[PDB]
Design an enzyme around this catalytic site. Sequence first.
Site: not given
Lengths: 402, 402, 725
Positions: C124, C146
């Site tokens: 990210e 995730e």
Amino acid sequence: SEEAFIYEAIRTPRGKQKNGSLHEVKPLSLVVGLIDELRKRHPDLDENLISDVILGCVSPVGDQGGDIARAAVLASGMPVTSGGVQLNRFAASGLEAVNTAAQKVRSGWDDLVLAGGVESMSRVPMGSDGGAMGLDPATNYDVMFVPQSIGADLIATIEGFSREDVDAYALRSQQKAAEAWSGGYFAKSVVPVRDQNGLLILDHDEHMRPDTTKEGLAKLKPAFEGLAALGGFDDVALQKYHWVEKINHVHTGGNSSGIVDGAALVMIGSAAAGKLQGLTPRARIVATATSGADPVIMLTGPTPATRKVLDRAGLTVDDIDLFELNEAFASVVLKFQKDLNIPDEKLNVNGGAIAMGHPLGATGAMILGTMVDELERRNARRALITLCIGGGMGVATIIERV
Amino acid sequence: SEEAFIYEAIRTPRGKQKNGSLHEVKPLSLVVGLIDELRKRHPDLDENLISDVILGCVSPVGDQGGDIARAAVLASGMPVTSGGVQLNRFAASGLEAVNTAAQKVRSGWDDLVLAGGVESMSRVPMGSDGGAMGLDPATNYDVMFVPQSIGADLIATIEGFSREDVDAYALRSQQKAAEAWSGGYFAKSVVPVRDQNGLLILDHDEHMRPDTTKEGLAKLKPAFEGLAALGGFDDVALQKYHWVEKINHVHTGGNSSGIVDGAALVMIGSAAAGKLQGLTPRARIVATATSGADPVIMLTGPTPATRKVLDRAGLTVDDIDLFELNEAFASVVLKFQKDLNIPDEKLNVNGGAIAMGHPLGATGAMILGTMVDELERRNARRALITLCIGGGMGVATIIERV
Amino acid sequence: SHHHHMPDNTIQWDKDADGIVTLTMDDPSGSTNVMNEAYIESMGKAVDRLVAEKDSITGVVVASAKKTFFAGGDVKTMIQARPEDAGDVFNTVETIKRQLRTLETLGKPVVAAINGAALGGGLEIALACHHRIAADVKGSQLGLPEVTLGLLPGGGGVTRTVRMFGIQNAFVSVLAQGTRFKPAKAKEIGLVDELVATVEELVPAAKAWIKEELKANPDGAGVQPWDKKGYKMPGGTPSSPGLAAILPSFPSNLRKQLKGAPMPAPRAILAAAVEGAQVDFDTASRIESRYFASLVTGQVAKNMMQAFFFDLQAINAGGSRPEGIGKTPIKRIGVLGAGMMGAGIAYVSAKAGYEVVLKDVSLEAAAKGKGYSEKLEAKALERGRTTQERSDALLARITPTADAADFKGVDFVIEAVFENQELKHKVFGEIEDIVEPNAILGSNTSTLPITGLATGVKRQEDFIGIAFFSPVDKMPLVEIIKGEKTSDEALARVFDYTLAIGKTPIVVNDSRGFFTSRVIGTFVNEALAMLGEGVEPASIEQAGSQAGYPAPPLQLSDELNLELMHKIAVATRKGVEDAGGTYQPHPAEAVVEKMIELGRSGRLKGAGFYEYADGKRSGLWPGLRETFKSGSSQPPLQDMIDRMLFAEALETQKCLDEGVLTSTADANIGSIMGIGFPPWTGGSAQFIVGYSGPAGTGKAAFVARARELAAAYGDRFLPPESLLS
């Protein structure tokens, strides 16, 4: 036969357009959030008695298409027999949804009905659904189409309302709305919008500018932003009203209704339905009516619609305690205030759409619920609600405190 | 208090989609053309008594946006006080517009109301307005969305309707509709569509195939054209109805409702309004009601909606002379015919949407006017009209010949 | 702001002469860079320094000092987040994305130098840069896993991935399944823009790209494509006609994949992806944060964080391993039998780099056992993942032979010979004198007790059970069964070997049915009982798939032979009536013997509960509804789902009380990776404390729902005393 009573009338805070709070909230959630609160207020209510859910929406496209009233019924967990209808009568969509809900109760074929409206203008702009009056040259030429922003300037030109006269009213709206929030008049009906976690998103009509001054309103430009920026409509209106030489453009962004998001819900049912559900009637609907006037000026509909309601209810102007007309344009209210001599202590006592905003499909129900609370706070007896509809239409409603 | 009577009920011929006749006619004209004929039938009628014009439209976008009911009022030269509201309750939009018009008359706040619908599917396709149930993944996942074409195949799978069973009904519809035109049952109500010069454009339901054979219906493919061509919905429905292993896809283009254009108008008013206008009441509306069932199967709404109407009207299944259910899918009618044992000499006696077409916003009023004429032609007394609404909704109506 | 409100500094500053900052992340409190409170404060101090000195800075380079670039986040904090802490979790991710958003809209080119792994929050950070250069090294993975923990990429992962590839390509390939990519595949899909050979070429090349960007594209320098005026999302927005036609099928196809299982993580990702595409970037990020806060505060995400993180780290640490034993290196390995088991055992043992002596009842069978390893070696080369030179040489380490003299030098025997009491003692007695005395005598066994099988050898202290799972190549679990005479060194010698072949071991004490076969039996037995009760078969298959199982039970009762389950009941009926106690048979035993009577005994015999044509399953058997009168009982589906889940959970608790297992980490991991327990529960034991029914949440809610299933379906659902009222 049966009398239609209003049991609940709630709304969301109206969120501004530019970088507003409700821009991330899909309009379906706004309705569900209000249904969640009606549940939180009456957990013992039998929702199977609810036979219909009528919602107003002027732009039923995208997030607001596909019968959003039915989508709110399913997404909120309401009974599958609750139905759900979307309707569009321009600005009076919210009030007509209440009027239609009231008439369904009087017939006896429906027992308990939710009504209201919803409009997320920050996501679904005004006029996104196209239109036959404005985009078909055959009829646009036949019936002389003029955007509301020019029909409003014409009302001021004919009646002699100056730029100072309209800006003076806008200052009055910003103040009484600021006095209403300070006095807590909106505490019990404005339902704060929250997310799926419970965190707050909006808890106040954030379009308000309580520090508006008379000088700041004169610094603004005449309304030349959306449809008025085109040529032609200036001369088209003067062909109909031939006795007017020059149109005096007085309406700006400060004396016109703001563009905001929001939603409103009204619970209407028969007397036996409320007693059986342990509900207390807060108001009774006495009469509704629909009329209209010249669609070129487009914004003089409320004046004949109000006289028709008073006649059917067997009442006059003196029998009304509170007047509430939608503040789409300041001169529309001043025209309505001159055709019928109405004191300012009775007209939009808690501010209006100029300060708090004008969610198209929901405004009719919002200003309705506003008069329900103010009738109890003042312990008054009657209130009258109208709007100025596009195309020269007019809808008016009389409620009576119970 | 007041009783709502039907005075007139006309419609346009339904024009096919592919290279159809009405493709050049804007949907606004179709409504105006019907208003022109109501004028030609009652030239002495005071149109100022008309207080509202309610139109159903399921895709109010483009040519059908901006409150088309109000556009028809202005473009046709109706009085400016005639109002005009557009509403959307999916397939039952036309019947709800009549039901809403009837309830407005019972309350007493409206005297005389035009109701109906309009849908030009060749120009404004189905689903062009977007939607919250189908295009928001949060709610599409929550309430298990399944297109009607799969909910209809599921009804056939559960109830045991074979591909021969549904195609047999489609042949019955094509015949009784062909018998109706041959017998002239539609001569007085079907208003031919003409241009601005008076030349004919359409004078018959051109979607009909009166030479349809039982073999030609079996040669067709299962409905894999629009939304069913996507993957996923096959297994999604079987998660809800866990006791069903395999969905039997039986519905095709021959046993499903056709996609056509058209419009319909119904004139409704009180008894004193018709006597004062020199009108003769042709039917009386006894009761309406809204119910629903499982939105996953989506098409079982008419069964509880019909029982609710019969209960409120104090009647049973034997008291009805004619049953008229919209032919959106053949198995929906057969399911409705099995839940309530109904003879075929009473169910869709003049054919249905499988042969003549299914204009979304107008079908409710069209099949209503069909039962008004057939009640007089047979000199029967009562008729019942329901539809199968998307989202698992149901609307039913009882009319009584006068 | 850029801060949360005195932690360490995990970022080193370094500016060159041209005005290009090198932000080297070096977290002192660990061996890898994690997105913890020390990072947020250290990154916030670095973001503020970039804005105040923007007049002399021309480019930015984000680098790492550890082995991996940046991996995951603070799991110890996210697992403690109660529902009342939703405000803090929202503010924390908003603070992190605000740092990245300022780094984006800096008006200066920003490049990321990915030396190692970039997983979770690590990727990210790289997506917030205008250019990404990674090094191709064995072990570098770049993905957003995730969703595997019940979470979603909260650091702008969903928002930026959808902005790069569109809703469909980003959700399908990157977001929904948490896919990890090699450095070559990442560039092929658009995550990485350019590659290099070694990590020493990263920083010098990232700066050279900035001077190129500033001189060639001065205006677009440091501006993302979605920050420009004429940006168009790939595949379109939910309003354009191209996507709006297939958008209704996105939630439907997702429910086809999840089979209706209660996993809110993939649903939340799709909503944030689509709702984020309808608005601008900043509003999309805020929407993304609301959904991430909803997952962390949930129960399902904690069940996955507890099992797929804290429990997996405990097994690889050596929890079920004798902590006071050294290391015994293994030289040669002997494999007895070469069926579907002995072939895969020899493959995973040689793929790690160990000499194998594969023996069977002949010499040609050892070729079919070696050939199954070569059939997978074709796919190892046809997929291009192997070296084709050293990989093709690994097949030379396997020595397929039939002469028992080839076991000379073997210090580890794994008997995969078929299950038979006398056959195991006969084969082991033949081979134990040939192999070394210190050799481990492992034996892959179904349900036969090792205490009885250990008597077939002399050195019972080296005899142990090493149960694999078919197919051996793909299945990651190895069930080590400790017998009575099994020494604690033999456990450590096999525990090390399981970690050597890249698999996960669990330790089970010798009990009737072991742990895997015992618990998975109650699962299929509860489904067979429902069929006998008169329940429609399609509901049972829906109840199994919606519970979260990978395969429905009636389908599994055909995979596992149905006559095999018969003698499992005969052996337990023999282990109680021999002890004099009255055997109370399970109601599922009648449905089995009824199917055995009708000649439908699984997929092997040609037909079972389903119908099979040329080895391909083709629908349920139509006569199943008439035989059991399916339709005479339509119970609630949630009662069906909770019956199969409670039975395995209640049976698991009895395995912990009886001493079958040691820790609950082996129970959760063993039930998930062995018998396919639904991952959203977090394991058969985590389902006990993480139950979320209508009567509450926790261990107390379990017991009430269990006692509710007891008064309506049988006393077998009554909870034991270890967790009793």
